[PDB]
Amino acid sequence: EHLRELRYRLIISIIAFLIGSGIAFYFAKYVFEILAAPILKSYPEVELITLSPTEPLFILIKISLAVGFIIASPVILYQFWRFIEPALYSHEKRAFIPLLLGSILLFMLGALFAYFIVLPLALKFLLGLGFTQLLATPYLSVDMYISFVLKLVVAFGIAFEMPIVLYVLQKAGVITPEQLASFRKYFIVIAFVIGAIIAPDVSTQVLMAIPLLLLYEISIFLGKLATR
């Protein structure tokens, strides 16, 4: 069962992700304007660029994909908790609901955090320094910005489930808070890895690596509270 449930439930997750990506397709234009909103109001001078002669569709597909992954998040979380919880660690069926709902609300919190906090601060470290506006008025690509935003929101959306999963592991006695405290530097490496992947440059990389390390020191605290 331990082998098969992984496969099955993951297939269900891919199904929900695909269907969710399908539903988000038609609304991807409105979502595109919503995503273009922060850079528009915060920096009216900056104008977007379509890059290669025609690629309007790639952005549509990427947006529909990411948003589709976000829509499928309750289902994916459900399958995840259903894969872990019932087998070993807890054996409490009443503790399933606030755990799932909590993880969902924290996923949403991660999204909103990425969009409303990290994003306008990310633009501040890039286009937001001094008189440099000379060097981008109509200078900016759409794909760069949009992919950056999507990857940022999805990343921080997932990474906000760190304190939960880690609290569960530390409560179950799987991972000791000490083992996490000794792993801090390697998690710095991980943070700069994620940052290197999603963020275009060093500035934004280190910028979003900060809350990642922040959420890591939250988990070690919840571990001390799990043991005591």
From Swiss-Prot:
Subcellular location per UniProt equals: Cell inner membrane
Which keywords belong to this entry?
Cell inner membrane, Cell membrane, Membrane, Protein transport, Translocation, Transmembrane, Transmembrane helix, Transport
MF (Gene Ontology): proton motive force dependent protein transmembrane transporter activity
Q: Which residues form a coiled coil?
A: none
A GO BP entry is:
protein transport by the Tat complex
- The membrane spanning regions, by residue number, are 11-31, 57-77, 99-119, 148-168, 187-207, 208-228
The way it spans or sits in the membrane comes to:
Multi-pass membrane protein
**Using the chain's own numbering, where are the disulfide bonds?**
none
Q: How does it assemble?
A: Forms a complex with TatA.
- Give the family, as the similarity comment puts it: Belongs to the TatC family.
Tell me the protein's name.
Answer: Sec-independent protein translocase protein TatC
What is the source species?
A: Aquifex aeolicus (strain VF5)
Q: Which gene encodes it?
A: tatC
